[PDB]
Paper text:
DsbA enzymes catalyze oxidative folding of proteins that are secreted into the periplasm of Gram‐negative bacteria, and they are indispensable for the virulence of human pathogens such as Vibrio cholerae and Escherichia coli. The TRX domain contains a pair of redox‐active cysteine residues in a CXXC motif located adjacent to a conserved cis‐proline residue. These features contribute to a hydrophobic patch of residues located in a surface groove of DsbA that is required for substrate recognition.
To identify the structural details of the interaction between TC and DsbA, we solved the crystal structures of TC in complex with oxidized EcDsbA and VcDsbA using molecular replacement at resolutions of 1.79 Å and 1.74 Å, respectively. TC also binds to the hydrophobic groove of VcDsbA but adopts a different binding pose compared to the complex with EcDsbA. The binding of TC does not cause major conformational change of VcDsbA. The hydrophobic groove of VcDsbA is truncated and flatter than the groove of EcDsbA as a result of a three‐residue deletion in loop L3 and a four‐residue deletion in helix H7. This results in the polar end of TC binding directly under H32 of the active site. Close inspection of the crystal structure also showed that TC makes additional hydrophobic contacts with R107 and D121 of a symmetry‐related molecule in the crystal lattice. Residues Q162, A164, K165, L167 and Y170 of VcDsbA, which are strongly perturbed upon addition of TC in the HSQC spectra, are all located within 5 Å of TC in the crystal structure.
Author numbering: 2 to 181
Write the structure that this text describes.
């Protein structure tokens, strides 16, 4: 069914050690916003033992892009992705009130009930710094040129504009998870 060059491209990076689906996104990206409920269904139907990893990119949002990457990494660090990922998309794309500075970015978390001391320790901490650097290294090493992008096993770039239903898009990802 699924064919190289048509349904996916092989990237220059080496294959991952264990099965993983990696999404590269930005909270500033409208298509990433549209994609988020689709991602939520992809995750629910992934084969047992396959990991899913969202990676935020810093090149949208002007001088707030890197701060927003740290914000996403903070959602991972604090284990509040289920609450904060839809909140942040909604703030930028429905309310259309993107944060003008880091104070407003922090306030978006506080206004959802995140503890201020826990946010401050995470946002400026080593785990978040390490995760943002990893977002960036993967994006650079993979030769990615934009978002959204979905990479399977560190090496197979999905061409979503090949699927003819949501179920077929899922079949393509699941097939790629079996490649080395
Ligand atoms: C779930 C698919 C991809 C989701 C997405 O947001 N793309 C980005 C992912 S990626 O970075 O390209 O991997 C989308 C992309 C193309 C979509 C199809 C096309 O839009 C064409 C039709 C449109 C109809 O309204 C619904 C069926 C459909 C046949 C769509 C089903 C589904 O929504 C598809 C298959």
């Amino acid at each position: 069914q699924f064919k190289e060059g048509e349904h996916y491209q092989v990237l220059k990076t080496p294959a991952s050690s264990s099965p993983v689906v990696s999404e590269f996104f930005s909270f500033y990206c409208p298509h990433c916003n549209t994609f988020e409920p689709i991602i939520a269904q992809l995750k629910q139907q992934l084969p047992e033992g396959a990991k899913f990893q969202k990676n935020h990119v810093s090149f949208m949002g002007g001088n707030m892009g890197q701060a927003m990457s740290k914000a996403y990494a903070t959602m991972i660090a604090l284990e509040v992705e289920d609450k904060m990922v839809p909140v942040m998309f909604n703030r930028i794309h429905t309310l259309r009130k993107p944060p003008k500075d880091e104070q407003e970015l922090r306030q978006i978390f506080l206004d959802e009930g995140i503890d201020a001391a826990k946010f401050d320790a995470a946002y400026n901490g080593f785990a978040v710094d390490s995760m943002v650097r990893r977002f960036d290294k993967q994006f650079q090493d993979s030769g990615l040129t934009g978002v959204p992008a979905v990479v399977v096993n560190n090496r197979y770039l999905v061409q979503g504009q090949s699927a003819k239903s949501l179920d077929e898009y899922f079949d393509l990802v699941n097939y790629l998870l079996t490649l080395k």
